[PDB]
Amino acid sequence: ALFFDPAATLSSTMRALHVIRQVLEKDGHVVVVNSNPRMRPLLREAAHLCLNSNVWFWADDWLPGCLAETDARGGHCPLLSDKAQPNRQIMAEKGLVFRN
RNA sequence: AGCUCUUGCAUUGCUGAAUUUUUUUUUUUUUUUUUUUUUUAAAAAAAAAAAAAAUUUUUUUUUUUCAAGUCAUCAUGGGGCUU
């Protein structure tokens, strides 16, 4: 067995979501990474239901040296792929982005 | 200038040995999506998927060490020789 905490996890959770909002609307790039296989289809659901162009997702294994960027991959496999943003390909295949 | 004179423990080259076995695991073509360089365009880069596959009658080819051998293969350093 191990620890629990209700107030801290809610506070940290709302805190991290506000952190995601500021880094997103300051024009950065957000990557969501979880390499546990059981929760991968939920991440596919999120990767199909997302709307903003800057949230990115990864579900497979973590390759050795992903963020090393030693050889110029222009960013590694978690970065800019159709796997990273599956929604961007389909949203542009439909052609209509939520655009004004 | 010429040595078939020496020195393979001065050498180049070439080879011996067993070190007898390893020489397929790796790319390329195509697709999709996207982005790097240049005043109407190619490459380039990145994520994924599919196929093509790797020379010759089947052995050659790739291989580490012995001052291993050869100055008579030619060469050539040194020394010797030229009634």
Please state, in angstroms and rounded to a whole number, the distance separating the CA atoms of residues A80 and A57: 10
Nucleotide at minimal C1' distance from the A83 CA: B47
C-alpha to C-alpha distance for A77 and A79, rounded to whole angstroms: 5
* Strand B nucleotides in reach of protein CB atoms, 7 A cut-off: 32-36, 45-48
Amino acid at A16: A
Q: Name the resolution in angstroms.
A: 4.2
Structure method:
cryo-EM
Select from A90, A93, A100, A63 the least CA-distant residue to A78.
A63
Nearest-angstrom CA–CA distance, A38 and A50: 20
Nucleotide nearest to A76 (CA to C1'): B46
Between CA A19 and C1' B22 the distance (Å) reads: 57
